[PDB]
């Protein structure tokens, strides 16, 4: 496999094109990584969560990493790693349009992880992309 | 609204055996770093090979890691496992040769797909958890 690093613009294309990543957070040196659906816009990754461990850990330590990848041709692939900052988006009017937009894109996907009983109680947030790197195998 | 439940530890081992790709997260000074990784699960441990580089350097400094694995279910369903783990680097010694040889026999073709020394290592599973979602 030719493996090479991706340009900044190639990294953006991978993030833009995909909807699922793995999000890692940490507490006291211990990482924690889970899958997450996101929507890319404006050098942020937007997402919804129910309350829980990852939200608690990111509230206390907003340093995160996100990994996103896709297939190419044959055994080919492209992968991006984002080093980021968690920013919670409280349910206030200044974030309502962001919330409405994100929810409309993620609403369907949210039906694929959100536990049923037996975007109101949801935590809406974004990951600000501070550093980004990419790799491709041909 | 998915039907979601927690898996037993036994159910988690079955997911780990049935899959060969995970995401490995390590950390340095509070900053996580997550990359894809091919692994072979065996007894208390995930085994993998790597070239020298950032993840290996970070794990040498801080052995605390997390590994996430998932697979599809019926329809929109899925199962996911998260391992809270401790990195242990494995020199090429007789006591680890069977572990290495077995791991390579499971992963040798896959290694072609990402590409002098290999570093051979394992992650000791300290906690494991899982989730299953059904439509
Ligand atoms: C493809 C896909 C997309 C998803 N998208 C989202 C999303 O956008 N937003 C969202 O909030 N969740 C999403 N999930 C579910 C997410 O991965 C978590 O399972 C869920 O959010 C609960 O995480 P938590 O930290 O709140 O766990 P808590 O409810 O606080 O539970 C903590 C315990 O559960 C375990 N645990 C939690 N999740 C998993 C898991 N995935 N696998 C194994 N163990 C787990 C932890 O290790 C720990 O033991 C998605 C899942 C899949 C497979
Ligand atoms: C399905 C699949 C299976 C893989 N299996 C293995 C395996 O078993 N063993 C193994 O060593 N590697 C595997 N890889 C490659 C792995 O994900 C890393 O890209 C590679 O090991 C280099 O990691 P490093 O920490 O040594 O980075 P270094 O060579 O030390 O480089 C660090 C820099 O490159 C960036 N970087 C590293 N990896 C990636 C990536 N995946 N995507 C975007 N940026 C990246 C970092 O963010 C940082 O900027 C696999 C990849 C895929 C897609
Ligand atoms: Cl699968």
TrEMBL record, chain A:
The keyword Nucleotide-binding applies. SUPFAM superfamilies: FMN-binding split barrel (SSF50475). Pfam families: Pyridox_ox_2. GO terms for molecular function: nucleotide binding. Keywords: FAD, Flavoprotein, Nucleotide-binding. FAD binds at residues 32, 35, 37, 48, 53-54, 79, 113, 133, 135. This is Mll6688 protein. It comes from Mesorhizobium japonicum (strain LMG 29417 / CECT 9101 / MAFF 303099) (Mesorhizobium loti (strain MAFF 303099)). The lineage of its organism: Bacteria, Pseudomonadati, Pseudomonadota, Alphaproteobacteria, Hyphomicrobiales.
């Amino acid at each position: 496999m030719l493996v090479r690093t991706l340009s900044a613009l190639e990294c953006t294309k991978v993030l833009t094109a995909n909807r699922v990543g793995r999000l890692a957070c940490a507490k006291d040196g211990q990482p924690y990584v889970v899958p997450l659906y996101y929507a890319y816009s404006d050098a942020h990754l937007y997402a919804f969560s129910m309350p829980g461990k990852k939200i608690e850990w990111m509230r206390a330590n907003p340093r995160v990493s996100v990994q996103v990848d896709e297939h190419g041709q044959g055994r080919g692939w492209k992968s991006v790693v984002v080093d980021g900052r968690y920013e919670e988006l409280p349910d206030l009017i200044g974030h309502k349009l962001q919330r409405d937009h994100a929810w409309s894109v993620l609403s369907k996907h949210t039906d694929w992880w959100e536990p049923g009983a037996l975007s109101a109680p949801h935590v809406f947030f974004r990951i600000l992309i501070e550093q980004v790197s990419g790799r491709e195998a041909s």
